[PDB]
Paper text:
Crucially, the formation of the binding site for the amino acid and its transport is strictly dependent on the binding of sodium ions. During the turnover, when a transport domain slides along the scaffold domain, a transient aqueous channel is formed, which creates thermodynamically uncoupled anion conductance.
We then solved a structure of GltTk_P208R embedded in nanodiscs and in the presence of Na+ and L-Asp using single-particle cryo-EM at 3.25 Å resolution. The structure revealed that all three protomers were in the fully outward oriented state, rather than the intermediate outward state observed previously for the wild-type protein in the same conditions, indicating that the states may be very similar energetically and minor differences in the experimental procedure can favour different conformation of the transport domain. The density of the arginine side chain points towards the lipidic environment. Combined with Isothermal Titration Calorimetry (ITC) and 14[C]-L-Asp transport assays the data show that the binding affinity for L-aspartate remains unchanged, the transport rate of L-aspartate is reduced by 2.5-fold in the mutant compared to the wild-type, and the anionic conductance is increased by 3-fold. Perhaps the interaction with the lipid leads to longer dwell times in the anion-conductive state, and somewhat disfavour the transition to the inward state, which is then reflected in the reduced transport rate and increased anion conductance.
Residue numbers in the entry:
A (entry chain C), C (entry chain B): 16 to 115, 129 to 430
B (entry chain A): 16 to 114, 129 to 430
Write the structure that this text describes.
Amino acid sequence: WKILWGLVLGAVFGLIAGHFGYAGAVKTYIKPFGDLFVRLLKMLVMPIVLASLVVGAASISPARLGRVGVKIVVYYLATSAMAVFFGLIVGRLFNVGANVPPSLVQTLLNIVPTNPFASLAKGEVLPVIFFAIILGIAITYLMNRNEERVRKSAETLLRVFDGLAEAMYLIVGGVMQYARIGVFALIAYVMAEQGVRVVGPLAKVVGAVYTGLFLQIVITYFILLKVFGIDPIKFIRKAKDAMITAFVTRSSSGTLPVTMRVAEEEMGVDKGIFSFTLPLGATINMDGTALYQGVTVLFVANAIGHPLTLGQQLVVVLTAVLASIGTAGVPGAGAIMLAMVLQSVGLDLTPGSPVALAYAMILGIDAILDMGRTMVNVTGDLAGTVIVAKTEKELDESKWIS
Amino acid sequence: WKILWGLVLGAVFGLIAGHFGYAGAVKTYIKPFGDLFVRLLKMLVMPIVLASLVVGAASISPARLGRVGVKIVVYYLATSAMAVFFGLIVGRLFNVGANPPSLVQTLLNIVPTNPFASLAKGEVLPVIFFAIILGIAITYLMNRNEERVRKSAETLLRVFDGLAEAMYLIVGGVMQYARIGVFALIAYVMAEQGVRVVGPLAKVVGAVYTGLFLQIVITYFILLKVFGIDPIKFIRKAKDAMITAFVTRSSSGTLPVTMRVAEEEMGVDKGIFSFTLPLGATINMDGTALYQGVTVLFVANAIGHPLTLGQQLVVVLTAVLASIGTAGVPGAGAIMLAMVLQSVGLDLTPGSPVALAYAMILGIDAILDMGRTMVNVTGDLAGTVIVAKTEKELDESKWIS
Amino acid sequence: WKILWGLVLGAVFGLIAGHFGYAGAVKTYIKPFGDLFVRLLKMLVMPIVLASLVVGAASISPARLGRVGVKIVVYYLATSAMAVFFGLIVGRLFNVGANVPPSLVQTLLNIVPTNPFASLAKGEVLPVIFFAIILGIAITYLMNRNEERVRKSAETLLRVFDGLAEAMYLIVGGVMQYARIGVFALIAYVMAEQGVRVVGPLAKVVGAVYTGLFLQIVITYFILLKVFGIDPIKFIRKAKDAMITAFVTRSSSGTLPVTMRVAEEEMGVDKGIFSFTLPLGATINMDGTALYQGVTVLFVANAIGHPLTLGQQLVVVLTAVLASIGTAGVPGAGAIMLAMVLQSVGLDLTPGSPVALAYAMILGIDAILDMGRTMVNVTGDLAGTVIVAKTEKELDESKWIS
Ligand SMILES: N[C@@H](CC(=O)O)C(=O)O
Ligand SMILES: N[C@@H](CC(=O)O)C(=O)O
Ligand SMILES: N[C@@H](CC(=O)O)C(=O)O
């Protein structure tokens, strides 16, 4: 566990530097090695998505793809709704807040791109997913054609994407060799920057939020995994490279390459499931963001002395799940969509309003909460993949046996 | 003809909704299914162009490509010039109007500065130039004496060949949804502009649509019979692209289905239809030229300054010249119509009522965009069969009952 | 030498037209045939880079790639530093000037792209180089795998890039058939436009700068080439297509396709060296830009009567080499980065001081100096490739024997 050692050592180094006022030295000396690690992984996000979906979709019939697609969507929505429920529980238990819209139809239509090459250039995950899935379905239909020229043309096209997919998986393994320094550098800069703001009432928010994410892993991804027969301890131990990487990169879409490599080289999941459930889940399944939004909504409301009612806590659950899909896999994306959650309950943010000062207080520790959010936003993607794969008999039983 | 049934049923539904003031309900309930249909076809425009040109150009020698290229350009210019002539005839008969980019730089823009940027920016002409020479280079490498170069070129062509067949397969799947997309698209357009066609604007719509109907049956029915191609079979076979262009209102948008129809219903070799269709989708728009001819007289007659006989000839050259300028996007004919009006001297100013007549046309621009795109792709199909017949690339079995 | 004949004939035609005031006719009649030539070559820059690096890197083991990479960087920095030294010598000898910042760490991090498809769309050479090199390294590792499916998938992926590379090399040969008209048109317009501004003190700058570039070729690329055994006369004669093309296109990145074709079809250099040293050198190795900056810094200083001291001439050398990497392979890129060189020595540019007046005077003949700059910015890339190839035994001895 050398990678995990860097996270603990870097946090101590960041706290020591932050307490001694050495944040400036770390920002211009250590961080540049953390930024290189983020850029290396963010580079492989697009090639590993276009290649994996085409090979993954072409390896299974469209009938099984529909069953797998519907199955994971129910899990994604149920876990996201459960995550918001946990957020209200931990927020009320800790009593946070003591002192002191995009079109839904247009968002669905945006799944279908107007230019597949522009979506790759613009770094859009969902439009690429739609184009690559139907490309894989079209490829596997051409391989069943009676003509020999069409069959060989489709095989050559798939081999290019198959060779591209294996190339990216190989590069990720090389990149993670540098992760022992990238993880150490990333956590050191974040700890040094925000090692002081967590002093008073903001500390209760961090404690309440992090308690919810910890409970979410061991009550939602430990009970459901045991129901379907997957060992929870093995799942957490195997998926520690993506959990640590998401805990430093703070971008679920950013830590997509390593999540794909871990899900297939450590869990034995077929390419027809993990290649589809991971990128789609990286854009629509973020339980940590939903749980964080639940706590902060109560924190903002309790700061201005207008706590949510029992009925008001139910409408905010639906919006939090709805806003969860809206958030992208980029750092600091949960605070932007948190405004829509606050406006849903009626707490509009006005330039000098009290609800616009509690919002600024959250943004002070937004990065320290972004770390916990991304840690579980990819764990749910992995946990759902094993659950769906177990029901589809695509799990490799040898990989889960000591 | 289930697809054609949706167009007629949707028009009735749109007229009923528009007359009862239910345009708001259609815009937020029905249009979203039409927008999905447009996005599905617009997605396949770029992959179906890059893959088809490479395979199409590599399947024939460059000598035949030059003969085919020159042959269709003469047809494209002759039909466009004829289309403007029809527009003046129908405009004068109906008595409508009762109540600049560098040319050299445009030609230089055909050669891209970055092939990947052209694909990302959705440019058809720069992609055409790069893909044609890529296909020519590929077919030259396959004739090399070295074995490694020959296999490398074959693998590169098979990737584009597999990509081309994949897009053609996806189009067939998309057109299964066209029974709902066409119905939704025509319903929203009819509901939105079912009231503005009431008075003098109705005469413009009648005069313009008469010209496009006459253009199909006098230009694409006489020339097709001269070269031996049956006109009735051509119209019946190319009804999927005609209907799709009549709802999408974007010739570049309805390029995928036009390619699939031209090869799975007409038996045209990939070396002709893959080249003549995208190039024609950017430079051959007879409906736009015919529409511009009628509206120029309508604008002039509205302000009481009719064009003279000499003034009607200079406006013909500009209309053909402005026809190439228009892109395959909705509402692109009105933007370039300003250049046609300024050519004859009718500059648009906020003070003069010249801009007032221009604004009146924009009110029914979408209802005229539907007829324009309907023939802008028919001419691309009609020219392809004419060129293919002269090149003996037409499949005679596909044109025999 | 028909191509070289057009350059001489076009210069005479441009001078005659410029002297008679016929620059307007040439700009709207002749230049458009030169612009077509530039667009044709600029189109092939990206496909010839992505395809060549992948095939070049996969053809050799990563151990040899590191040795070649380090070897050429030392040559690139040594020649660039030598070029600035020559600029001060010719500038002081001619006595020019008689009358009258981007982050370094961020620039290095920008080598690793965040989206490989966006880098291709945005026309970035260095980010594409990094992605294509590791893609080639990953491909050659997959071909050594024990599995048969992975081996065939990697071979198919390489054959696509191999077929793409040979296609671009074939297109360049076709484009250079038109170069007899493109070179004539390009040089005619430039000569006609700036055939009058070279009259007085600006003529001394052109003479001093062009003397330095001529001396650089015959003292730096003629002594070092003879040391390693490569004939200097054969190198210049063979690499005359790229030298002339760079002398009209005025963009080293623009004249990358022909430089690649000349380096492999006339010098017998393996694809693992020239495909890597040329595009990297087209962005970081510009000796002509460095030599031009050295002369103009003294010219600007001497114009305002504040000549550089002996110590001040050494700090300006380091910045000129540092600013040399900053310049891109586009026309007029040396004047933009020349401001940083002037500010390094203390000569900040202000509208009031005549420092900007001397800078504006240089911009008047910037294009006539851009021609000489690009002529040697690609010669150094070619000269370094043969030197590195000779040490790696990848040079074809048959191509260098009459
Ligand atoms: N940065 C988080 C989203 C958030 O800000 O909540 C992620 O990528 O998962
Ligand atoms: N939208 C039309 C052009 C026009 O507006 O006339 C087309 O794509 O063909
Ligand atoms: N245009 C030159 C750079 C410069 O302006 O000095 C080149 O591409 O090499």
